[PDB]
């Protein structure tokens, strides 16, 4: 079936959060189920005998078909010094570039878990409750998100380590320059294993996190879901993950099944095989990207001609801004940073001023006296995937002065630090024009298929019968918050009820 193409009963497109959550599901209800993942299973020791390259040491691994390496964004004044050219290659993480917008996303069995940042974050009830009205938010709290964080292994920093460590004075400083100015922190829940990262600093087990290490993927201490919920979905007995396979066009069968064309290329990008893979029930878990980038070629070309107008529409990135202030030369941030966050500013009141932003490391090994954040803003500004025929692509029309209602929330609240303190904005960290925020990048894109408008208030796409979204392209815009819990409590509540009233 994946070896020649064939029926499965369920397809599962992706194998990131929405797409691992449904299906471990489907596997302990009994349905065999098929993963379709176009990049890789990461699990072969690599040239310097670890799966993943480091932020210090970027080699093919780290960009998915790129020809030179790139710096982690803020970090270009320190790290273009370690940039090669690579063979392009099936690496893990991939810059997709729109028109006026940048969008990072994981490439591999586990999607952005292999990439991401750990931050593990429930968004506050009040605001879920105004973005997705239609949803009963007492089984969300009550239930889902409870089954989220222990499913994926949230874990708690200890605080008296937290205080004494070289790794996390960069955050302390944050905390206190933060302090001056009357805004609180909060600690961020994570699924990199604290413990572990605690013996790391110890010298008691391989650093990954202590040894910069985050997105190109940890070698150690961090549960991306190939740990957590695939591991138990390929426990079921129920389920198989191929990988090195996307999916490139749907058909609905004459008979109310779907029909999938999936491309199968090695390492290097070179086509082996075109397959013909068929089922009765599928589930996209492609991404916000890779779902929406679906639906619409299918409406467009013909191929699922019933879909709405809704679908492609609704993107928004998470009101993701990225900004960066000078420390007082008292105030270093230190050369040693953990690469996981582990504090965030909290000035989230559902406001358009609301901001919260996360207290980022950075990974240059000496000092900088830099403190670098991560702002996740409300802004009402959405942009629309278009599909173009000539390129067989879904366009994203997001413009950068899209992004100004976010760049103001951000510049306000941290324009109140720089006044508490006397500090002022780097304006070099992403390019050479003066530019303190960076206002066209997107770590956590939301939108394009979105809940109770593209679909039913549990995914099912309108137009079709057994055909579901499970991903982030469901969340309209924003949750306020870092949104893997988000995708995957959504997940879990999503692919109960599909089970008990479709399966
Ligand atoms: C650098 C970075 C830092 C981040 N930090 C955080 C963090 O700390 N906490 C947080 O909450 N979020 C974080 N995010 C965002 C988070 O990783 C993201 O919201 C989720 O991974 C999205 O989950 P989905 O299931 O929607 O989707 P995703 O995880 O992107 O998975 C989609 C999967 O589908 C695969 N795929 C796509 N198209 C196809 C196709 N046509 N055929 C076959 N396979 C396909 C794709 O390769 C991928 O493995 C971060 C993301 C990045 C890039």
Same mark, same amino acid.
């Given at each position: 079936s994946a070896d020649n193409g064939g029926y499965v009963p =369920?397809?599962?497109?992706?194998?990131?959060?929405? =797409?691992?959550?449904?299906?471990?599901?489907?596997?302990?209800?009994?349905?065999?189920?098929?993963?379709?993942?176009?990049?890789?299973?990461?699990?072969?020791?690599?040239p310097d005998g670890?799966?993943? @390259?480091?932020?210090?040491?970027?080699?093919?691994?780290? #960009?998915?078909?790129?020809?030179?390496?790139?710096?982690?964004?803020?970090?270009?004044?320190?790290?273009?010094?370690?940039?090669?050219?690579?063979?392009?290659?099936?690496?893990?993480?991939?810059? *997709?570039? &729109?028109?006026?917008?940048?969008?990072?996303?994981?490439?591999?069995?586990?999607?952005?878990?292999?990439?991401?940042?750990?931050?593990?974050?429930?968004?506050?009830? #009040?605001?879920?409750?105004?973005?997705?009205?239609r949803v009963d938010s007492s089984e969300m709290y009550d239930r889902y998100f409870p089954r989220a964080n222990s499913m994926l292994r949230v874990?708690?920093?200890?605080?008296?380590?937290?205080?004494?460590?070289?790794?996390?004075?960069?955050?302390? *400083?944050?905390?206190?320059? =933060?302090?001056?100015?009357?805004?609180?922190?909060?600690?961020?829940?994570?699924?990199?294993?604290?413990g572990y990262m605690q013996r790391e600093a110890a010298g008691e087990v391989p650093k990954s996190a202590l040894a910069t290490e985050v997105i190109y993927g940890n070698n150690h201490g961090k549960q991306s879901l190939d740990k957590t919920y695939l591991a138990a979905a390929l426990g079921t007995g129920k389920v198989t993950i191929q990988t090195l396979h996307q999916v490139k066009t749907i058909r609905q069968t004459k008979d109310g099944g779907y029909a999938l064309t999936v491309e199968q290329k090695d390492t290097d990008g070179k086509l082996l095989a075109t397959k013909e893979i068929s089922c009765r029930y599928l589930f996209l878990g492609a991404g916000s990207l890779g779902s929406t980038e679906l639906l619409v070629r299918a409406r467009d070309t013909g191929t699922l001609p019933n879909l709405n107008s809704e679908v492609g529409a609704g993107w928004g990135p998470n009101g993701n801004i990225m900004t960066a202030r000078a420390n007082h030369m008292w105030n270093p941030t230190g050369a040693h940073q953990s690469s996981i966050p582990a504090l965030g500013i909290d000035a989230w009141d559902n406001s358009d001023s609301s901001?919260?932003?996360?207290?980022?490391?950075?990974?240059?090994?000496?000092?900088?006296?830099?403190?670098?954040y991560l702002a996740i803003t409300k802004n009402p500004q959405r942009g629309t995937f278009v599909y173009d025929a000539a390129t067989d692509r879904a366009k994203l029309n997001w413009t950068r002065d899209q992004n100004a209602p976010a760049v103001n929330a951000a510049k306000a609240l941290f324009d109140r630090i720089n006044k508490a303190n006397g500090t002022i904005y780097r304006y070099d960290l992403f390019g050479t024009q003066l530019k303190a925020f960076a206002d066209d990048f997107c770590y956590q894109?939301?939108?394009? @298929?979105?809940?109770?408008?593209?679909?039913?208030? &549990?995914?099912? *796409?309108?137009? &079709?019968?057994?055909?579901?979204?499970?991903?982030?392209?469901?969340?309209?815009? #924003?949750?306020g918050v870092n949104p893997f819990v988000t995708i995957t409590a959504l997940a879990e509540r999503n692919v109960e009820r599909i089970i008990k009233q479709d399966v």
């Amino acid at each position: 079936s994946a070896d020649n193409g064939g029926y499965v009963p =369920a397809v599962v497109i992706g194998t990131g959060y929405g =797409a691992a959550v449904s299906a471990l599901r489907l596997g302990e209800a009994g349905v065999q189920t098929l993963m379709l993942e176009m990049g890789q299973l990461w699990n072969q020791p690599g040239p310097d005998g670890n799966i993943f @390259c480091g932020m210090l040491n970027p080699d093919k691994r780290s #960009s998915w078909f790129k020809n030179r390496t790139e710096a982690p964004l803020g970090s270009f004044l320190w790290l273009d010094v370690v940039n090669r050219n690579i063979d392009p290659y099936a690496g893990v993480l991939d810059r *997709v570039n &729109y028109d006026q917008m940048s969008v990072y996303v994981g490439r591999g069995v586990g999607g952005g878990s292999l990439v991401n940042g750990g931050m593990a974050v429930e968004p506050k009830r #009040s605001y879920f409750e105004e973005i997705l009205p239609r949803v009963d938010s007492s089984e969300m709290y009550d239930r889902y998100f409870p089954r989220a964080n222990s499913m994926l292994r949230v874990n708690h920093i200890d605080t008296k380590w937290f205080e004494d460590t070289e790794w996390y004075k960069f955050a302390r *400083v944050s905390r206190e320059q =933060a302090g001056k100015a009357g805004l609180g922190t909060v600690f961020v829940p994570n699924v990199y294993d604290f413990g572990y990262m605690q013996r790391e600093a110890a010298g008691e087990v391989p650093k990954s996190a202590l040894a910069t290490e985050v997105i190109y993927g940890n070698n150690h201490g961090k549960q991306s879901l190939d740990k957590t919920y695939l591991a138990a979905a390929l426990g079921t007995g129920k389920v198989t993950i191929q990988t090195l396979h996307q999916v490139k066009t749907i058909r609905q069968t004459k008979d109310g099944g779907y029909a999938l064309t999936v491309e199968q290329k090695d390492t290097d990008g070179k086509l082996l095989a075109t397959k013909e893979i068929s089922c009765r029930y599928l589930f996209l878990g492609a991404g916000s990207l890779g779902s929406t980038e679906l639906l619409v070629r299918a409406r467009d070309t013909g191929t699922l001609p019933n879909l709405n107008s809704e679908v492609g529409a609704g993107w928004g990135p998470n009101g993701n801004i990225m900004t960066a202030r000078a420390n007082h030369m008292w105030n270093p941030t230190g050369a040693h940073q953990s690469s996981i966050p582990a504090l965030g500013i909290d000035a989230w009141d559902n406001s358009d001023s609301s901001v919260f932003a996360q207290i980022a490391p950075m990974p240059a090994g000496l000092e900088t006296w830099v403190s670098l954040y991560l702002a996740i803003t409300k802004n009402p500004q959405r942009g629309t995937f278009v599909y173009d025929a000539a390129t067989d692509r879904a366009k994203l029309n997001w413009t950068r002065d899209q992004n100004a209602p976010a760049v103001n929330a951000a510049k306000a609240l941290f324009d109140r630090i720089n006044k508490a303190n006397g500090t002022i904005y780097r304006y070099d960290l992403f390019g050479t024009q003066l530019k303190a925020f960076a206002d066209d990048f997107c770590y956590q894109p939301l939108g394009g @298929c979105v809940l109770g408008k593209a679909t039913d208030d &549990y995914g099912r *796409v309108a137009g &079709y019968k057994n055909l579901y979204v499970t991903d982030g392209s469901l969340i309209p815009g #924003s949750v306020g918050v870092n949104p893997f819990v988000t995708i995957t409590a959504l997940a879990e509540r999503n692919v109960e009820r599909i089970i008990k009233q479709d399966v």
